[PDB]
Structure 1
Amino acid sequence: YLSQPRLTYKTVSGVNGPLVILDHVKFPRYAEIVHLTLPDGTKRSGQVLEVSGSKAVVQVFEGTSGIDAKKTSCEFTGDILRTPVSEDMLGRVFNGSGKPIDRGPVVLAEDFLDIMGQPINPQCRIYPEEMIQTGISAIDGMNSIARGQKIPIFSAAGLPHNEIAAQICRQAGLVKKSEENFAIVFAAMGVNMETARFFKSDFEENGSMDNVCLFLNLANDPTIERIITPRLALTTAEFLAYQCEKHVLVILTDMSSYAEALREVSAAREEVPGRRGFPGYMYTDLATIYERAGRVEGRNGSITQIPILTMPNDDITHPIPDLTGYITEGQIYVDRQLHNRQIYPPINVLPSLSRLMKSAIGEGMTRKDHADVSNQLYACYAIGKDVQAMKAVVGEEALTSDDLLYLEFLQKFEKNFITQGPYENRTVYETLDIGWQLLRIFPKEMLKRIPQSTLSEFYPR
């Protein structure tokens, strides 16, 4: 509809770091996109960040290099960045900027949507309470994830978080038992290409590449396009959810690289720092990345996020894990100690927490004794850890029978409940039965987290 011929100015009044200043620019358009013609002919791209008077500062997605103040040219679009969306993109592969990788064509773009998206009306929200079938006992039963929720996984270097992602995207299901399937979405964030190859291979292992919207980005690629890639993936998810009536299992990876790129941009822009030197608006940026989820009235679709992140130095008070914990409801926190104990799946059950037990579980969905079983198991595990710490110094001689019972319960809990294996999908009922069998070792009297009625009803077996 825009019948305005395009413009191009050569007045480059400077370059400082990843920023470029354009003087004599006529009527700047804020939050614009521009294209750059290097003297040798290579194409480049960027977005206008700041405007003041007849000046316009502009940051370059792929990074400043080779730009000449007298030879290069810059042309102006007049419209905010809009990305091509398409339902046929499933089963394809692209780089961070969206261009094809598999010798595929320029996508035929069902519409052009805002990269920055738009918020969602508050009143137009419906709470999700459908339990998802993950097949992991440590998730189904303890930290059960429901539709329309965004639980991440806090992992460090060398941990098998990639295999956890593989399992959760493979054994997805519905606890409440036509056909079902999840439109996978995944975007890399500069991760080394070996993990990308492994994810690709596992995605053919699923056998449903026709429902795999994939994006890629490697370490050697320019750092600053990582700021764009997740937003493009989220726009695709929005299009496939609220326009095609489909469920999408959006998953990300390596948010630490995203934080680092945003940090570098902020340092180039010399904003006011915060904790550990991070940007002040990193929180609002993360909010724009994550809160784009859920399901709304009039639509059967839903958005589920699993934005796994790296956790430097295994420090919980590190800012990135902290702020990610604030903005979200739940966490998993795969453990280094368990992986060094040679146990799989190594998920620490205690630090993990899910906030959707309030409606996901209960009578009419799973059972009338799920919540009290989980609470009792949590309490028993915590006190088992405490008495283990006591035994670490005091010695078995001075202990009491209760201490030995708690240690044996902890041993049973670790050898049986957590040990689940790589390809053994398990039902909710089996996990509940296993938990009841584990709990059977303690007589009924010391169970201080179970009501009388349920305890009389179910225990004597």
Structure 2
Amino acid sequence: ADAKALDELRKPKFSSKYLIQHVSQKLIPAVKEWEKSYQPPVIHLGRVLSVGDGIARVYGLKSVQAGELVCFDSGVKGMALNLQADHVGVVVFGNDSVIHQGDLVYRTGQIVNVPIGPGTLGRVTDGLGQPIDGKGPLTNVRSSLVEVKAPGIIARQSVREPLFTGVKAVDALVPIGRGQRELIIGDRQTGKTAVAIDAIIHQKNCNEQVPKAQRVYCVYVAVGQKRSTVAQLVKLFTQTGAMRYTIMVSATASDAAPLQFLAPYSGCAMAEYFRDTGKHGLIIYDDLSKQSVAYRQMSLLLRRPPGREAFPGDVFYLHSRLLERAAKLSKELGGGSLTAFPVIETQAGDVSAYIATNVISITDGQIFLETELFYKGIRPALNVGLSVSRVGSAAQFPGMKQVAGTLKLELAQYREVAAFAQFGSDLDAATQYVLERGARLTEMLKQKQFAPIPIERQTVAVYAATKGFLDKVRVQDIVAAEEAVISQVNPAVFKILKANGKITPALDAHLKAELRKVKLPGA
């Protein structure tokens, strides 16, 4: 039955036409009596063959591009994943209960788009860019592809500028540069969102103090979250004024798994508007561990072979091609940047899980948030021994770099001395200096929620702690000693430290002088 024997059936070999001529005069009368039972034929449109599991099989669509938006006649979007010889498998961006077998699939003629621009700033959109805040359509905006390739080696430069989080433990010990991706990884309920929210609130405080080219425009992508959590978060950004600079992309827990899978690419494309036009972006992918679970659902429903923890083989490429778009661009490309904060939830502190170790291999540092430090009230529960930022170090505040080298070191000894003897075997006077200074600096670094600190008030507060000026207070009123420090010093000393960037020797002993005339609550 080879094709050598089948392509002989191209040329006619009947030599007897007594049935060709007969039915050629009865076929068109036969088809004409069955026309209200024919659906109209389909070549460049599509018709749905099978729908189920959130994947439609579409007959027709002769000229769909691979991976483009198709539109069902229900109004639902899809994306032509695999073009096959006979059908097209599309993944439905929405509920598949409204797609039937026999429905028309229309072609939009464009690979998957989101509206990007200045007019997407302020808005709450879904995983596809359609706004859900109810205040109209997006205007002053244009469409861009959600699967752009990341800039290459020659389109980048080194990470030089600091992105100030406003979180005290972060901007001192794990400092974030401005084109750098940084993983926020921890267990459930450990302050992972609170570090990312405090970064977004803090950029609002700094955009009214920087000359328009150093303004950070944040983007928050919420994948798999509760819709009440997203609505409580939009209200917090609206009441702090942070929605003027924030895009809120939301694919919640009830949304379709292709919408949750697409929402971090949709939000990265909206934030890449600011990277590509010389501005600076801040993208937060809250639970990128929830986006891999949504993509695992689509890959198993497409009957692709599962690997470790039943994740597909390309779940690394899911996240790596996403986080590679967070770059600092070179000066011929505008000098813009995009810094990412993926969030990974961890089960029982196990950092050696599959998706956790994938994103550690992609991102530049981590912010580990320990459950045990979070239960002791040390919030943000930053695991100092494990949290890294090597691209953002030597890109941080020069004043903070002076005082945090001693802070990282006195915490490095504090973990090492507490490793030896926490129970009272014998206490040296030299090591009880370390436990007295270590518990001083730990209470120093813990700060409360939704009030990020400027970097000049943050340098002074650690200057007052790595040096003397706080050894009088035991451990308890150090939180109250900080506003005793930062309110009682002359507020000009924050202006010189901000404008120079570092602690000059003129300001050094001026600030020793102001820290001796502050009145400390532990007396």
TM-score tier (shorter): 0.7 to 0.9
What amino acid is the match of 1:53? A
1:116 Cα deviation from its structure 2 partner? 0.5
CA gap 1:78/1:95 in 2 versus in 1, 3 angstroms: closer
Q: Does the residue aligned with 2:90 lie in a helix, a strand or coil?
A: strand
Output the CA distance in 1 between the equivalents of 2:138 and 2:201. 27
1:342 Cα deviation from its structure 2 partner? 2.3
The answer for unaligned runs of 5 or more in structure 2 is: 1-41, 473-507, 517-523
Tell me, yes or no, if structure 1 residue 187 matches structure 2 residue 218. Answer: no
Q: Which residue of 2 aligns with 1:98?
A: 129
Structure 1 residue corresponding to 2:382, chosen from 347, 364, 368: 347
CA gap 1:150/1:16 in 2 versus in 1, 3 angstroms: same
1:378 Cα deviation from its structure 2 partner? 4.3
Tell me, yes or no, if structure 1 residue 143 matches structure 2 residue 180. Answer: no
Runs of 4+ in 1 over 6 A off after TM superposition: 438-441
More displaced 10-residue stretch of structure 1: 44-53 or 17-26: 17-26
In the TM superposition, what whole-angstrom CA distance separates every residue of 1:192-213 from its partner, at most 9, and x where no partner exists? 1332233222212332432222
What TM-score do you get using the length of structure 1 for normalisation?
0.82
1:27 Cα deviation from its structure 2 partner? 4.9
Tell me, yes or no, if structure 1 residue 52 matches structure 2 residue 84. Answer: yes
CA gap 1:221/1:52 in 2 versus in 1, 3 angstroms: closer
CA gap 1:223/1:401 in 2 versus in 1, 3 angstroms: same
1:177 Cα deviation from its structure 2 partner? 11
- 2:67 touches 2:79 (CA, 8 Å); kept in 1? yes
Output the CA distance in 2 between the equivalents of 1:146 and 1:22. 46
What TM-score do you get using the length of structure 2 for normalisation?
0.73
Tell me, yes or no, if structure 1 residue 291 matches structure 2 residue 291. Answer: no
Q: Which residue of 2 aligns with 1:444?
A: none
- 2:410 touches 2:434 (CA, 8 Å); kept in 1? no
CA gap 1:335/1:64 in 2 versus in 1, 3 angstroms: same
What amino acid is the match of 1:113? S
Output the CA distance in 2 between the equivalents of 1:367 and 1:160. 23
Aligned-pair identity in percent equals: 23
Structure 1 residue corresponding to 2:442, chosen from 414, 428, 446: 414
Q: Which residue of 2 aligns with 1:266?
A: 299
Output the CA distance in 2 between the equivalents of 1:330 and 1:438. 32
Tell me, yes or no, if structure 1 residue 249 matches structure 2 residue 285. Answer: no
In the TM superposition, what whole-angstrom CA distance separates every residue of 1:84-120 from its partner, at most 9, and x where no partner exists? 2221221222222322223333324643322101231
More displaced 10-residue stretch of structure 1: 181-190 or 26-35: 26-35
Tell me, yes or no, if structure 1 residue 30 matches structure 2 residue 61. Answer: no
Q: Which residue of 1 aligns with 2:153?
A: 122
Q: Does the residue aligned with 2:82 lie in a helix, a strand or coil?
A: strand
Higher gyration radius (CA): 2
The answer for unaligned runs of 5 or more in structure 1 is: 442-456
- 2:218 touches 2:282 (CA, 8 Å); kept in 1? yes
1:141 Cα deviation from its structure 2 partner? 2.2
More displaced 10-residue stretch of structure 1: 113-122 or 432-441: 432-441
In the TM superposition, what whole-angstrom CA distance separates every residue of 1:159-189 from its partner, at most 9, and x where no partner exists? 3333322322223449x99365422211221
Cα RMSD, aligned residues only:
3.2
- 1:383 touches 1:406 (CA, 8 Å); kept in 2? no
Q: Which residue of 2 aligns with 1:166?
A: 197
Output the CA distance in 1 between the equivalents of 2:420 and 2:358. 32
In the TM superposition, what whole-angstrom CA distance separates every residue of 1:400-451 from its partner, at most 9, and x where no partner exists? 4444444333333333x2233443723324324422339999xxxxxxxxxx
Superposition pairs for residues 81-96 of structure 1, below 5 Å? 81-96=112-127
Q: Which residue of 1 aligns with 2:496?
A: none
Q: Which residue of 2 aligns with 1:449?
A: none
1:18 Cα deviation from its structure 2 partner? 2.8
Output the CA distance in 2 between the equivalents of 1:99 and 1:126. 34
Q: Which residue of 2 aligns with 1:446?
A: none
- 2:385 touches 2:412 (CA, 8 Å); kept in 1? no
1:382 Cα deviation from its structure 2 partner? 2.6
Tell me, yes or no, if structure 1 residue 386 matches structure 2 residue 419. Answer: yes
